[PDB]
């Protein structure tokens, strides 16, 4: 029933921009927060980024601090993502997680539910 | 008058083990004595953040 399907990602040209956005259904979605995570295809998971229950209170990761600019709507249960340079390295499958708090409140300890993944392939091609 | 006199010997509760958490052991007196996980309450089964 629970779902987090995501949507917005192709094939972009390296220094461009893209637009993550990920839906949610019948889970309260105001109420946990929302992380965004990377995985890479042979080199394991990488934590992107996170937006707190609110909307405000916005921190990232190190390797992708000011890289990448995230952003929420309640009304409409919307996660938004926006990459505004993507170098080679950001081709990765990219997940939008409900994480609520359980030791670590704002980075998010429990990720319960995970959505399928949307494939960023960026490419000078 | 008469008086009962006994030394009672020592008492001391056999050693015990620290429970894994998550573990919910059957206790005394009809009590469900929890560890509960992190983030649950005291219930194992209900969130608290």
């Known amino acids: 029933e629970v779902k987090l399907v995501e949507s917005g990602g192709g094939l972009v040209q390296p220094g461009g921009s893209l637009r993550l956005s990920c839906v949610g259904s019948?889970?309260?979605?105001?109420?946990?927060?929302i992380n965004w995570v990377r995985q890479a295809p042979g080199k394991g998971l990488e934590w992107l980024a996170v937006?707190?229950?609110?909307?405000?209170?916005?921190y990232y990761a190190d390797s992708v601090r000011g890289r990448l600019t995230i952003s929420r709507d309640n009304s409409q249960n919307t996660a938004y993502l926006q990459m505004n340079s993507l170098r080679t390295e950001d081709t990765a499958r990219y997940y939008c997680?409900?994480?609520?708090?359980?030791?670590?409140?704002?980075?998010?300890?429990?990720?319960?539910?995970w959505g399928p993944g949307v494939g960023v392939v960026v490419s000078s091609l | 008058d008469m008086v009962g006199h006994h030394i009672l010997g020592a008492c001391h509760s056999s050693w015990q083990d620290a429970p894994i958490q998550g573990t919910s052991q059957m206790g005394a007196h009809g009590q469900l004595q929890t560890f509960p996980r992190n983030g649950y309450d005291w219930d194992n089964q209900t969130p608290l953040e």
């Open positions: 997680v409900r994480a609520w708090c359980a030791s670590t409140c704002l980075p998010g300890d429990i990720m319960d539910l």
């Open positions: 019948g889970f309260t979605f105001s109420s946990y927060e």
């Open positions: 937006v707190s229950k609110i909307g405000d209170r916005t």
